[PDB]
Protein backbone atom coordinates (compact mmCIF):
# COMPACT_ATOMS: atom_id res chain seq x y z
CA UNK A 1 0.00 0.00 0.00
CA UNK A 2 0.99 3.67 -0.62
CA UNK A 3 2.73 5.44 2.28
CA UNK A 4 1.99 8.93 3.60
CA UNK A 5 4.15 11.36 5.53
CA UNK A 6 3.41 14.97 6.48
CA UNK A 7 6.06 17.57 5.64
CA UNK A 8 7.80 19.71 8.30
CA UNK A 9 7.45 17.13 11.08
CA UNK A 10 9.22 17.83 14.37
CA UNK A 11 10.44 15.65 17.25
CA UNK A 12 13.13 12.97 17.42
CA UNK A 13 14.47 11.43 14.19
CA UNK A 14 14.40 8.91 12.63
CA UNK A 15 10.69 8.00 12.58
CA UNK A 16 9.19 4.61 11.69
CA UNK A 17 7.05 4.49 8.54
CA UNK A 18 6.35 0.80 7.85
CA UNK A 19 8.01 -2.57 8.54
CA UNK A 20 8.85 -4.53 5.39
CA UNK A 21 8.75 -8.32 5.67
CA UNK A 22 9.31 -11.19 3.25
CA UNK A 23 7.46 -14.53 3.31
CA UNK A 24 10.79 -16.38 3.01
CA UNK A 25 11.64 -14.90 6.43
CA UNK A 26 11.58 -18.22 8.31
CA UNK A 27 13.10 -20.29 5.48
CA UNK A 28 16.31 -18.21 5.41
CA UNK A 29 18.03 -15.17 6.98
CA UNK A 30 16.98 -12.04 5.05
CA UNK A 31 18.70 -8.66 4.66
CA UNK A 32 16.78 -5.54 3.57
CA UNK A 33 17.74 -2.58 1.38
CA UNK A 34 16.18 0.43 -0.34
CA UNK A 35 17.20 2.21 -3.55
CA UNK A 36 15.94 5.25 -5.47
CA UNK A 37 15.92 9.04 -5.27
CA UNK A 38 15.67 9.73 -1.54
CA UNK A 39 17.51 6.53 -0.61
CA UNK A 40 20.87 5.85 -2.33
CA UNK A 41 20.36 8.53 -5.00
CA UNK A 42 20.10 12.32 -4.41
CA UNK A 43 18.75 13.32 -2.00
CA UNK A 44 20.75 10.59 -0.24
CA UNK A 45 19.60 9.23 3.13
CA UNK A 46 16.19 10.92 3.42
CA UNK A 47 14.78 7.42 3.88
CA UNK A 48 16.65 4.49 5.41
CA UNK A 49 15.87 0.86 6.24
CA UNK A 50 17.17 -1.34 9.06
CA UNK A 51 18.90 -4.17 7.20
CA UNK A 52 17.85 -6.94 9.62
CA UNK A 53 14.43 -5.84 10.91
CA UNK A 54 13.17 -4.21 7.69
CA UNK A 55 11.87 -1.06 9.37
CA UNK A 56 11.57 1.74 6.81
CA UNK A 57 12.34 5.15 8.32
CA UNK A 58 12.37 8.85 7.45
CA UNK A 59 15.47 10.65 8.80
CA UNK A 60 14.56 14.34 8.47
CA UNK A 61 11.66 16.77 7.96
CA UNK A 62 10.17 16.61 4.47
CA UNK A 63 9.22 19.45 2.14
CA UNK A 64 6.30 18.97 -0.25
CA UNK A 65 7.40 21.95 -2.36
CA UNK A 66 10.84 20.39 -2.87
CA UNK A 67 9.64 16.81 -3.48
CA UNK A 68 5.98 15.78 -3.12
CA UNK A 69 6.34 12.18 -4.24
CA UNK A 70 9.09 9.62 -3.63
CA UNK A 71 9.46 6.38 -5.58
CA UNK A 72 11.70 3.81 -3.88
CA UNK A 73 12.38 0.09 -4.16
CA UNK A 74 12.81 -2.43 -1.35
CA UNK A 75 15.18 -5.35 -1.80
CA UNK A 76 15.24 -8.62 0.16
CA UNK A 77 18.42 -10.72 -0.02
CA UNK A 78 19.21 -13.88 1.93
CA UNK A 79 22.55 -14.60 3.64
CA UNK A 80 23.44 -16.88 0.70
CA UNK A 81 23.47 -13.86 -1.64
CA UNK A 82 20.28 -14.34 -3.67
CA UNK A 83 17.33 -11.97 -3.97
CA UNK A 84 14.34 -13.76 -2.42
CA UNK A 85 11.81 -11.30 -3.86
CA UNK A 86 11.55 -9.01 -6.87
CA UNK A 87 12.37 -5.37 -6.03
CA UNK A 88 9.13 -3.94 -4.60
CA UNK A 89 7.96 -0.42 -5.51
CA UNK A 90 7.38 1.91 -2.57
CA UNK A 91 5.51 5.16 -3.23
CA UNK A 92 5.86 7.79 -0.50
CA UNK A 93 3.44 10.73 -0.69
CA UNK A 94 4.30 14.01 1.03
CA UNK A 95 1.17 15.63 2.46
CA UNK A 96 0.95 19.42 2.60
CA UNK A 97 1.34 21.93 5.41
CA UNK A 98 0.33 25.58 5.04
CA UNK A 99 3.93 26.81 5.27
CA UNK A 100 4.05 29.13 2.26
CA UNK A 101 2.72 32.70 2.33
CA UNK A 102 0.88 33.86 -0.79
CA UNK A 103 3.02 35.84 -3.24
CA UNK A 104 1.89 38.68 -5.50
CA UNK A 105 3.00 38.50 -9.15
CA UNK A 106 4.36 42.05 -8.88
CA UNK A 107 5.55 44.25 -6.02
CA UNK A 108 3.85 47.30 -7.56
CA UNK A 109 0.79 46.95 -9.81
CA UNK A 110 -0.18 49.91 -12.01
CA UNK A 111 -3.72 50.94 -12.94
CA UNK A 112 -5.72 53.97 -14.02
CA UNK A 113 -9.29 55.29 -13.92
CA UNK A 114 -11.25 58.21 -15.40
CA UNK A 115 -12.44 60.60 -12.68
CA UNK A 116 -15.96 60.53 -14.16
CA UNK A 117 -16.22 56.72 -14.00
CA UNK A 118 -19.47 55.48 -12.42
CA UNK A 119 -19.33 53.72 -9.03
CA UNK A 120 -18.81 50.01 -9.79
CA UNK A 121 -16.38 50.54 -12.67
CA UNK A 122 -13.52 48.04 -12.94
CA UNK A 123 -10.09 49.67 -12.78
CA UNK A 124 -7.36 47.03 -12.53
CA UNK A 125 -6.56 43.48 -11.39
CA UNK A 126 -4.09 42.26 -8.77
CA UNK A 127 -2.98 38.64 -8.50
CA UNK A 128 -1.09 36.36 -6.14
CA UNK A 129 0.08 32.75 -6.27
CA UNK A 130 0.50 30.24 -3.45
CA UNK A 131 3.05 27.42 -3.57
CA UNK A 132 1.06 25.12 -1.25
CA UNK A 133 -1.30 22.31 -2.36
CA UNK A 134 -4.30 23.85 -4.16
CA UNK A 135 -5.64 20.44 -5.22
CA UNK A 136 -6.19 18.78 -1.82
CA UNK A 137 -6.13 21.61 0.75
CA UNK A 138 -7.24 25.21 1.26
CA UNK A 139 -3.64 26.17 2.09
CA UNK A 140 -3.53 27.95 -1.28
CA UNK A 141 -7.11 29.27 -1.48
CA UNK A 142 -6.49 33.02 -1.73
CA UNK A 143 -8.72 35.94 -0.75
CA UNK A 144 -7.91 39.54 -1.68
CA UNK A 145 -8.44 42.54 0.63
CA UNK A 146 -7.36 46.20 0.70
CA UNK A 147 -5.33 47.03 3.82
CA UNK A 148 -4.92 50.80 3.36
CA UNK A 149 -5.41 53.75 1.00
CA UNK A 150 -3.15 56.80 0.58
CA UNK A 151 -4.32 59.48 0.58
CA UNK A 152 -7.51 58.76 2.54
CA UNK A 153 -9.26 61.56 0.63
CA UNK A 154 -12.05 62.49 0.15
CA UNK A 155 -12.44 59.37 2.33
CA UNK A 156 -10.58 56.12 3.11
CA UNK A 157 -12.76 53.72 1.05
CA UNK A 158 -12.55 55.03 -2.54
CA UNK A 159 -11.86 51.56 -3.97
CA UNK A 160 -12.77 47.95 -3.24
CA UNK A 161 -11.33 44.60 -4.34
CA UNK A 162 -13.31 41.52 -5.36
CA UNK A 163 -12.10 38.97 -2.79
CA UNK A 164 -12.07 36.12 -5.34
CA UNK A 165 -10.91 37.78 -8.56
CA UNK A 166 -8.55 40.52 -7.34
CA UNK A 167 -10.35 43.09 -9.50
CA UNK A 168 -10.17 46.56 -7.94
CA UNK A 169 -13.25 48.71 -8.60
CA UNK A 170 -14.41 52.27 -7.95
CA UNK A 171 -16.58 51.93 -4.85
CA UNK A 172 -17.75 55.53 -4.47
CA UNK A 173 -18.01 58.89 -6.22
CA UNK A 174 -15.49 61.62 -5.40
CA UNK A 175 -12.46 61.07 -7.64
CA UNK A 176 -10.72 64.38 -8.33
CA UNK A 177 -7.59 64.50 -10.50
CA UNK A 178 -6.79 68.12 -9.55
CA UNK A 179 -6.69 67.37 -5.81
CA UNK A 180 -5.61 63.72 -5.49
CA UNK A 181 -3.88 62.62 -8.74
CA UNK A 182 -2.82 59.15 -7.51
CA UNK A 183 -3.70 56.59 -4.84
CA UNK A 184 -1.34 54.08 -3.25
CA UNK A 185 -3.30 51.01 -2.14
CA UNK A 186 -1.76 48.37 0.09
CA UNK A 187 -3.44 45.13 -1.01
CA UNK A 188 -3.41 41.83 0.89
CA UNK A 189 -3.56 38.21 -0.23
CA UNK A 190 -4.35 35.58 2.39
CA UNK A 191 -4.75 31.81 2.06
CA UNK A 192 -7.34 29.58 3.82
CA UNK A 193 -9.99 31.58 1.92
CA UNK A 194 -8.73 34.77 3.62
CA UNK A 195 -8.22 33.32 7.09
CA UNK A 196 -4.62 32.12 6.86
CA UNK A 197 -1.12 33.32 5.99
CA UNK A 198 -0.84 36.68 4.26
CA UNK A 199 1.37 38.97 2.17
CA UNK A 200 1.08 42.58 1.00
CA UNK A 201 1.90 44.53 -2.16
CA UNK A 202 1.09 47.94 -3.65
CA UNK A 203 -1.44 49.07 -6.24
CA UNK A 204 -0.86 52.57 -7.63
CA UNK A 205 -3.88 54.12 -9.36
CA UNK A 206 -3.54 57.22 -11.56
CA UNK A 207 -6.66 59.37 -11.98
CA UNK A 208 -7.41 60.40 -15.59
CA UNK A 209 -9.73 63.09 -17.04
Of 98 and 122, which has the nearer Cβ to its own copies?
98
Tell me which of Ca ion, its own copies, none is bound by residue 100, counting a contact when its beta carbon lies within the kind-specific cut-off of 5 to 8 angstroms.
Answer: Ca ion
Measured distance CA(58)–CA(69) in Å, rounded: 14
Name the residue nearer to its own copies (CB basis): 25 or 110.
25
Lay out the site mask for its own copies across 14-53 (x = CB under 8 A, - = otherwise): ----xx----------------------------------
| 86 has binding-site annotation | no
| Out of 8, 105, 172, 184, the residue judged to bind its own copies by CB under 8 A | 8
* Binding segment toward its own copies, per CB under 8 A, in 8-16, 27-35, 62-70, 160-168: 8-16
Q: What gap in Å lies between CA 55 and CA 47, rounded to an integer?
A: 11
Report the relative pairing of strands 88-95 and 122-125 from DSSP bridges: unpaired
Which of 38/54 has CB closer to Ca ion?
A: 38
Q: Select from 6-14, 34-42, 68-76, 152-160 the region that touches its own copies (CB under 8 A).
A: 6-14
* Nearest distance, CB of residue 144 and its own copies, angstroms: 19
Return the number of other C-beta atoms located less than 10 Å from residue 157's C-beta: 10
67, 84, 114, 197: which one contacts its own copies (CB under 8 A)?
197
Kindly state the smallest distance separating residue 68's Cβ from its own copies, in Å. 13
Does 96 bind its own copies (CB under 8 A)? Our answer is yes
- Share in percent of the chain as helix, strand, coil (round to 5): 5, 45, 55
DSSP 89-120: EEEEEEE--S----EES-SEEEEEEETTPPTT
Report d(CA 107, CA 126) in Å as an integer.
10
The span from the CA of 26 to the CA of 143, in Å, is 59
Specify whether the CB–CB gap between 208 and 112 falls below 8 A: yes
- Residue 136, interface with its own copies (CB under 8 A)? yes
Amino acid sequence: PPISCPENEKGEFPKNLVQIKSNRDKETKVFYSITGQGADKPPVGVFIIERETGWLKVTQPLDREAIAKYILYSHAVSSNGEAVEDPMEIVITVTDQNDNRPEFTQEVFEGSVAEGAVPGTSVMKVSATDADDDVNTYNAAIAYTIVSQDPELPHKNMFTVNRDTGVISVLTSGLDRESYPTYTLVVQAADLQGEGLSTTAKAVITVKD
